[PDB]
Amino acid sequence: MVGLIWAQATSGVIGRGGDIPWRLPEDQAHFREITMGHTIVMGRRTWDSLPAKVRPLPGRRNVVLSRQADFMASGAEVVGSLEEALTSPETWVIGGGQVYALALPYATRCEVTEVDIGLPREAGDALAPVLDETWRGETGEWRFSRSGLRYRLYSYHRS
């Protein structure tokens, strides 16, 4: 069971200048609830942006898609290809927009956090992947973050 997890503005932006243009504690805890105990797969840039206190993320099998034979994520399995990383019953892909895209065909779940934020798309922006017709799921009921923005949740089996 490959799945995808990400948080985006309504515009589809998920990353900007290597960081995130917001910070939702609530969504952090959801991210951890769904991934805890499972294998997590990330591209290099994602890994590098992890604050050292949680490189690797605890209780999870950290896997990094790179292609440098010497990249060596301290506390992570470095892997040259995606399907070379999915040996598991539950695997969550955690970005970035690049890794996401390569993973979407093998995926049956996407857990999507939508942040009510006017964030028009700028060149260079990292975007959430585009889910076609086969992806079904509720449109979560809105919520206030203690940060002051609105957010909601989305989920998609398929097949």
Ligand X SMILES: CS(=O)(=O)Nc1cccc(-c2nc(N)nc(N)c2C#CC2CC2)c1
Footprint of its own copies on this chain (CB under 8 A)?
1, 32-34, 36-37, 59, 88-90, 136, 138-141, 153, 155, 157-159
Our measurement of the distance from residue 91's CA atom to the centroid of its chain's CA atoms, rounded to an integer in Å, reads 11
Q: State the Cα–Cα distance between residues 111 and 83, nearest whole angstrom.
A: 20
Residue 94 interacts with ligand NDP (CB under 6 A)? yes
Binding mask 93-112 for ligand X (x = CB under 6 A): -xx-----------------
Binding mask 47-86 for ligand X (x = CB under 6 A): ---x------------------------------------
Which DSSP string corresponds to 57-119?
Answer: PTTSEEEEE---TT---TTSEEESSSGGG--SSSEEE---HHHHHHHGGGEEEEEEEEEE---
Q: State the Cα–Cα distance between residues 72 and 20, nearest whole angstrom.
A: 25
Contact of residue 108 among Co ion, ligand NDP, ligand X, none (CB under 5-8 Å per partner type): Co ion
Contact of residue 107 among Co ion, ligand NDP, ligand X, none (CB under 5-8 Å per partner type): none
Q: Which amino acid would we find at residue 100? A: Y
Residues in 138-157 that interact with ligand NDP by CB under 6 A: none
